[PDB]
Amino acid sequence: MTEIRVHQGDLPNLDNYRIDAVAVDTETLGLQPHRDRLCVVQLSSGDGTADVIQIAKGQKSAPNLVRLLSDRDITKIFHFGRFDLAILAHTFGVMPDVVFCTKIASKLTRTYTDRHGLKEICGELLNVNISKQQQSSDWAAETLSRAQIEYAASDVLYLHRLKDIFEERLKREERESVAKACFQFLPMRANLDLLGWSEIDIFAHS
Amino acid sequence: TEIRVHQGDLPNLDNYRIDAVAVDTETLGLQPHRDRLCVVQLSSGDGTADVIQIAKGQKSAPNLVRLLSDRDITKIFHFGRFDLAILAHTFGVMPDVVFCTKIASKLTRTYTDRHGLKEICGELLNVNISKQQQSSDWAAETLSRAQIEYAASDVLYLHRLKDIFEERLKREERESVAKACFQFLPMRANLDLLGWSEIDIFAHS
Amino acid sequence: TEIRVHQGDLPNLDNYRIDAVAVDTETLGLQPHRDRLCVVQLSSGDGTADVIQIAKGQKSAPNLVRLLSDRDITKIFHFGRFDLAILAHTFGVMPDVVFCTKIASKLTRTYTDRHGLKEICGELLNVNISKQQQSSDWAAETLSRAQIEYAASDVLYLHRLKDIFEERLKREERESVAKACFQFLPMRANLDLLGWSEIDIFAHS
Amino acid sequence: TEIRVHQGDLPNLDNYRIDAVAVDTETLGLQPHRDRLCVVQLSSGDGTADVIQIAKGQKSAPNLVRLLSDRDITKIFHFGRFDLAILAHTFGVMPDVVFCTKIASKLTRTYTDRHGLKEICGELLNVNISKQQQSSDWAAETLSRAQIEYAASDVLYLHRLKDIFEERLKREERESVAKACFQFLPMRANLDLLGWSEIDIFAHS
Amino acid sequence: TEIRVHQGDLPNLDNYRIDAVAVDTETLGLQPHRDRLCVVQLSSGDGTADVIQIAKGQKSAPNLVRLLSDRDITKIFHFGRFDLAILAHTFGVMPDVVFCTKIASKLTRTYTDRHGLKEICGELLNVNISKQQQSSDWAAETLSRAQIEYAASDVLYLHRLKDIFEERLKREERESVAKACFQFLPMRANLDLLGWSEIDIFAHS
Amino acid sequence: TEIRVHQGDLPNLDNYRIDAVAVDTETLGLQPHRDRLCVVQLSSGDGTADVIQIAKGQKSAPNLVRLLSDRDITKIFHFGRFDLAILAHTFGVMPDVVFCTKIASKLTRTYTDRHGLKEICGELLNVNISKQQQSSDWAAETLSRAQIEYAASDVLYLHRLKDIFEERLKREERESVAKACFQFLPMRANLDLLGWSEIDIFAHS
Amino acid sequence: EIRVHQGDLPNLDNYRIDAVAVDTETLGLQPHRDRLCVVQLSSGDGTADVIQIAKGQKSAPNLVRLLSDRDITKIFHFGRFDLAILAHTFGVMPDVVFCTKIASKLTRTYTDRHGLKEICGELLNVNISKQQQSSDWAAETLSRAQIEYAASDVLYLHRLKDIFEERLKREERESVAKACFQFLPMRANLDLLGWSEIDIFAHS
Amino acid sequence: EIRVHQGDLPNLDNYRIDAVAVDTETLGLQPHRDRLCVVQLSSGDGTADVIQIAKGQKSAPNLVRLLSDRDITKIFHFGRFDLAILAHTFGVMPDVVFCTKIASKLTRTYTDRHGLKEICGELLNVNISKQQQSSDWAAETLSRAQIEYAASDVLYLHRLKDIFEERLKREERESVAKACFQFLPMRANLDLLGWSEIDIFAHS
Ligand SMILES: Nc1nc2c(ncn2[C@@H]2O[C@H](COP(=O)(O)O)[C@@H](O)[C@H]2O)c(=O)[nH]1
Ligand SMILES: Nc1nc2c(ncn2[C@@H]2O[C@H](COP(=O)(O)O)[C@@H](O)[C@H]2O)c(=O)[nH]1
Ligand SMILES: Nc1nc2c(ncn2[C@@H]2O[C@H](COP(=O)(O)O)[C@@H](O)[C@H]2O)c(=O)[nH]1
Ligand SMILES: Nc1nc2c(ncn2[C@@H]2O[C@H](COP(=O)(O)O)[C@@H](O)[C@H]2O)c(=O)[nH]1
Ligand SMILES: Nc1nc2c(ncn2[C@@H]2O[C@H](COP(=O)(O)O)[C@@H](O)[C@H]2O)c(=O)[nH]1
Ligand SMILES: Nc1nc2c(ncn2[C@@H]2O[C@H](COP(=O)(O)O)[C@@H](O)[C@H]2O)c(=O)[nH]1
Ligand SMILES: Nc1nc2c(ncn2[C@@H]2O[C@H](COP(=O)(O)O)[C@@H](O)[C@H]2O)c(=O)[nH]1
Ligand SMILES: Nc1nc2c(ncn2[C@@H]2O[C@H](COP(=O)(O)O)[C@@H](O)[C@H]2O)c(=O)[nH]1
Ligand SMILES: Nc1nc2c(ncn2[C@@H]2O[C@H](COP(=O)(O)O)[C@@H](O)[C@H]2O)c(=O)[nH]1
Ligand SMILES: Nc1nc2c(ncn2[C@@H]2O[C@H](COP(=O)(O)O)[C@@H](O)[C@H]2O)c(=O)[nH]1
Ligand SMILES: Nc1nc2c(ncn2[C@@H]2O[C@H](COP(=O)(O)O)[C@@H](O)[C@H]2O)c(=O)[nH]1
Ligand SMILES: Nc1nc2c(ncn2[C@@H]2O[C@H](COP(=O)(O)O)[C@@H](O)[C@H]2O)c(=O)[nH]1
Ligand SMILES: Nc1nc2c(ncn2[C@@H]2O[C@H](COP(=O)(O)O)[C@@H](O)[C@H]2O)c(=O)[nH]1
């Protein structure tokens, strides 16, 4: 039922992305961007479809996707964008700077819990069950499995719906300016990770 | 060292027609909702300081607050995350043009893990800071001679630290990093007052 | 089970001419200064419950508060240290005649280390409590049916729990120990509100 | 520094016709069921102390127990949680009109995490307590002058500490908080004797 | 299979003219000075068990205590450090001829770090031990059938386990190691009663 | 699945005229000085395995040791650090041409933190490895068929794992890193036997 | 006064006594890797014998005869270690022992510091230096400081035992201490056999 | 006597030898963020060469020739770090090395302290100060205390190595030590490739 377009290297064009907000996710060979290459970028406009883009080893360029990432009129939605921003900026040399993060939004609104993972959020906010089984798999394979392609699409298909709910909660609890300042700093927090401070809360006393 | 002591507020801003002011606070503790602001310290960088005693329940300090709100004047702190919280909580205005020597030390002094004011004054200025008066009753009606000297010393050197740290930030090409951190710092302090003082808001968990 | 849902307050105290009332609350979190009171639940012990939706900024609940301040009525909680704090912070009245089933469990169920409401209901009543709705948006304008049944079942069994624990407290000759703990509990909750929520005030360090 | 040394008990109560007495104890250790009470120290706050050696197997000390039972005389301890347990356990009498300087320190000295007797005596009185004789044989038939002086120095200043803490509790409006903690402290000590010494009875877990 | 429930004591020792007896206990908790002995379980190894309810304050159990003090009869426990301590504390007799399957397992089942009774019965005997009833009210006047069957299952297999462990201890030539551990075990339980329960008396620190 | 069981040694090397042999061991535990080698398992990668019971006190295994010493045959292990140590300790010969799938996994499966053989077989081969017989009595005279099948399953897949891991090592350009780790692996195992088993010899501290 | 010997005692003339204070120096805390280098003995008369042990030495007949003597109590501070390395080097496990650390843990219940330095400072007002503890004890020639540190760890063990024995009698723990000392050689054997990281009596 | 240079050794006249002592100073412990600032060399003759490395410098031909010479053993204390930052900066990973920290971990089994200061104090009775360690090593002009501190960290490595070789021989661990030194360049490569927080041989 869910249409998933799979691409090699880049989007063919931006026909599906003349929109004000785009959901973004990535798959990699690990959590360390200097060691673990970008393997997949996922995108959704919010219409129930997704694009899954395989990134080859040593790929330096993805003009259409990077046009989206640098377009200040388009908000990039992420879940825990701290990671996705870092590997994207590392790979293509462009740090997106108009972002919304559903993990940060959750930490500022779902104050009645300590579990802010995407699976827990989708279940509670949308009654949608996400599987994390394919997360630890070989994302650098020449041909992605059906299950990998569906996992990868599942991580962007719901971010618009989550963002809409979190914005209502941020308004209801009067934390919009707080959230906005956090989103403003998130790209620099990702840059700090790339520069060597990934283990350091830079605002902590010690 | 000339240390001018005041009750409630500065009498005027004659000593503060400057581009940056060093700011510090003493309190009854680390929890601003429980522990009242007790002293505000200022220095223009000229070797003198103003020590201002804040009374219990004091809601206003118009001259000092005009300094704190002046977007043309950078406020210099050491670990301003705490000072910004108690100042905004007490007088109702969050300064938003700031420089923090602790964030700056964490961005430049990468060869150490000690970023306290005493360690920094030692290494960068060969100045020895005493911290013995930090745990004392700062809400006392009359501050002791040693409290007043301690309270002054915490702002006397911040201008010199800033100038060194700015040189190192430039040398290592980290100016835009530090600027971005200083920009978020007031909101980081706000997040402390709102209830997130135990949470790294950017951590995975 | 019959569950009466109200906006703002009980309509009257016709169901609560009793010596003990079961009380519980739902909030937006564990930090009363940030996380508002959203729901208050009551039960007389007869299998029925009242679920009271508390609006944002609501300052009074005259009928509910009459019960909380009525010294002829014992208020039964599970971990009242929390409910007492958010009730007192929201409506300005700290209940002072209380029974806490968690303290009672810690004083009687010495053969275990789990003292949660779910474990206690399973062991003493063979009642299966579900905690799935605990993490939900309790500030929603319309509560879900799942939410309303969860909120109610957290008070339906406290009378039966209290009766069992009172027998255990008598068997093990610890009534006076428990009474003294119950008498301090309001002050323990007060201490949380004042800033000592992370401090065991009686510990050595 | 006048220190009267007695065996078994006070010879009489002539130095203790007062409304508050400073009390301390020395033991073979921290576990009252294994480690016997060895020394009981008293001071009226006049700069003298009575050090009372307690014998192995001793079940009574009538003059001391008359003081501890007297509802008209406040007993002042530093960390009376422990002293109350070992005295109630040895002589059968739990004092219930008490003042504890450690609890008072935690309620007032919010600018610090150090609440030992040494740190308090230094900051509030400029008095230097030595802790060297703390680990020594307090059951020794004959106590060294070092031991006798240590034992008396733990009661000589509690009156002066109390007065200062009373002024802080008044300044910060925590008088009724401190009172309620002092009221529960005997039960906190009873709880320790009954087997809950490792349990904060009010903790969630 | 056949479980015999007695009040207070065995009626006689007709079933216990044997060389070794499996012993187990149920209590109100892990702290013998606070948590009373409630049930004692015995088996001869013939597939039947005796389950003896011990009343509150019961000082005497003459047929049971005859077994405990009989130097010709090995008492078999699983983690007898605990059962020994509560029996000695309750009836005043410390058994000194013991075999512990948990110590034997730590000395023979070197290929694993799990040494509880459940995992040992599964591996050595393919017997499934349910631990659901471990946390129940063992001081209840009438014990449930589940309770009685759980309490008997903890002695029905200790003879079989002892035989297998003795074979493994002989295979690996550790018989004299185990014998000395069993000689010391009643003193290790005594050390717990005396106040050293948290202390490895043979550790460096 | 054909499994050949042998007492003492392989009858001959007819099935092992190959470039690489999968190797695994079963012991009485993780401490070679205490825990004797019990079983050695081999596979050529053809879907069959040989399982070799090693007797207590056995000092030679000529044909197996001939494979272990042959520099033209690569020995494949999962976590060979352990297997190399116990084979060297038992038969006095440390193999030196090895491939290890745990080290391989740590150098290629950077997208996970679980590098156990069960998890690797699951993800790379869709083969379900049961670890239930792991904690069993490997010194028994007669091994159960479940034990023999467990023992053979730990060598039946190591060839297929090796091939996949070699493709990953080439794709990520870590062949020479892996090779230096394997070259050092026998000395890492010697270090374990000599007494450094708990020390990372390259760590700062 | 400190007598330094090679390999063994010349005779047992100084050791016709009830109790001997015993101590060792090694290359570390692992007896299977770290060899026995020195053995120190005192009779309690304020003198000591320091016995350099050679690499590969398998016997020391006069010392071993002391360690074997059921009539002579061997006194240690933390004999768990010394018994292990003596048994592992010479094949004989002493079985008549007294350990001041266990004694201290059973009597000095007002403290958590049971090191030999604290016990000496408190019970004897004697200051023990530990500087030479980490030094090359396999050196062919031991320094004067090394030789005195070696001796100082046995010169006081008789005085400590007598104090502890009074504390044990005062608190009625004589039979508790005796059973601990009874088990202690086996606790040492358990260390030798592979259980050195395991409290054998713990629940887990 | 300490010779201070900019960028590189002028020539190799003082280093026609078998073993050179090597050390580095940096802006921190992360080679990808914290640049190499100083390289220190000593021939063991009581003198030292202190070389200041400029920001962005990619070559130092005379120094790199020493590091590449298989006939010259490079001596380090905790070479795992120095090898990483040298290979990252100049592109050459030295492969004939000796590490006094690894050797201390293989010989000084009677202690758990293996820092350079602690080792220099016990084996040479030389007192090292770590006060200048936390300082701005990227300064255009190094202070006198910085230059002296930088030199002192190479001045004694030759003497430490001789003592450790005697210990390794006495305890029969020469081959064990040689294999650790052989792997050490790969241990440092592993760090640069992203495994600096992982013991690659641990079970988990
Ligand atoms: N090592 C490790 N990597 C993870 C873990 N979770 C996610 N990753 C890596 O991070 C990438 C993004 O995670 P995802 O967006 O699938 O949750 C994955 O493709 C995987 O490489 C984890 O728990 N451990
Ligand atoms: N940087 C970082 N990202 C993580 C970690 N664990 C999971 N992630 C990332 O966080 C997202 C999913 O985390 P979740 O919030 O769902 O637990 C994915 O982007 C995944 O790669 C981690 O430990 N560090
Ligand atoms: N952060 C957090 N909040 C909780 C947790 N459990 C309960 N709460 C909050 O505390 C309130 C107490 O309600 P109850 O636990 O009785 O449902 C809940 O409504 C919820 O807001 C928890 O585990 N973590
Ligand atoms: N202070 C605190 N309260 C909790 C926590 N988790 C649950 N609670 C509260 O404790 C009560 C029931 O907890 P339970 O004992 O059932 O686990 C509810 O009021 C619930 O909100 C916690 O982690 N901390
Ligand atoms: N075990 C132990 N007992 C202590 C410690 N500190 C004090 N004690 C015991 O507690 C008694 C009273 O303590 P004080 O009033 O001297 O602080 C002392 O005589 C001593 O028996 C300690 O740190 N450990
Ligand atoms: N429960 C407990 N009491 C202590 C401890 N240390 C000292 N005490 C008791 O506390 C008092 C002295 O504590 P301090 O002077 O450190 O505040 C004495 O009464 C002493 O017995 C400890 O570690 N635990
Ligand atoms: N507090 C506590 N007590 C236990 C626990 N397990 C067993 N007990 C107590 O110890 C007694 C003996 O345990 P059992 O022989 O049933 O395993 C039980 O009757 C019960 O009172 C536990 O995990 N926690
Ligand atoms: N010290 C201690 N004893 C326990 C604990 N749990 C159970 N016990 C006691 O020791 C026995 C251990 O049983 P296991 O867990 O080995 O099957 C129980 O029967 C009970 O008597 C525990 O956590 N600590
Ligand atoms: N002590 C201990 N030994 C284990 C454990 N797992 C495996 N072993 C031992 O190590 C041997 C080899 O492990 P395997 O190859 O079966 O995974 C087993 O035969 C067993 O003796 C464990 O978790 N703990
Ligand atoms: N050093 C060590 N080895 C282990 C441990 N657990 C299992 N092993 C060994 O590692 C192998 C099992 O590896 P796994 O399947 O857990 O990756 C077997 O050879 C087993 O003996 C452990 O905790 N520590
Ligand atoms: N690794 C290490 N070994 C020690 C330590 N303390 C003592 N030793 C070793 O244990 C031996 C016991 O002798 P003593 O410590 O009484 O001088 C010493 O000779 C020394 O080899 C320590 O802290 N660490
Ligand atoms: N397990 C252990 N034993 C030590 C340690 N330090 C010293 N020892 C042993 O304990 C003896 C002295 O004990 P201490 O005086 O340190 O309490 C030494 O001779 C040595 O055998 C240590 O850190 N750990
Ligand atoms: N962050 C941090 N860096 C250190 C520390 N010690 C040394 N460094 C860095 O590592 C370099 C190594 O030089 P050394 O420590 O040999 O003087 C130093 O120049 C310094 O940059 C430390 O404790 N913390």
Ligand SMILES: Nc1nc2c(ncn2[C@@H]2O[C@H](COP(=O)(O)O)[C@@H](O)[C@H]2O)c(=O)[nH]1
């Ligand atoms: N990982 C780590 N390395 C250090 C630390 N301090 C110093 N180092 C590194 O280790 C080298 C030697 O340190 P040392 O062994 O003297 O303590 C230094 O030159 C520096 O490169 C530290 O705290 N942690």
Ligand SMILES: [Mn+2]
């Ligand atoms: Mn992601």
Ligand SMILES: [Mn+2]
């Ligand atoms: Mn994803």
Ligand SMILES: [Mn+2]
């Ligand atoms: Mn400040």
Ligand SMILES: [Mn+2]
């Ligand atoms: Mn200050």
Ligand SMILES: [Mn+2]
């Ligand atoms: Mn609740």
Ligand SMILES: [Mn+2]
């Ligand atoms: Mn509830």
Ligand SMILES: [Mn+2]
């Ligand atoms: Mn005291």
Ligand SMILES: [Mn+2]
């Ligand atoms: Mn005292």
Ligand SMILES: [Mn+2]
């Ligand atoms: Mn049991």
Ligand SMILES: [Mn+2]
């Ligand atoms: Mn049982």
Ligand SMILES: [Mn+2]
């Ligand atoms: Mn294996």
Ligand SMILES: [Mn+2]
């Ligand atoms: Mn296996």
Ligand SMILES: [Mn+2]
């Ligand atoms: Mn020793």
Ligand SMILES: [Mn+2]
């Ligand atoms: Mn010694």
Ligand SMILES: [Mn+2]
């Ligand atoms: Mn260095």
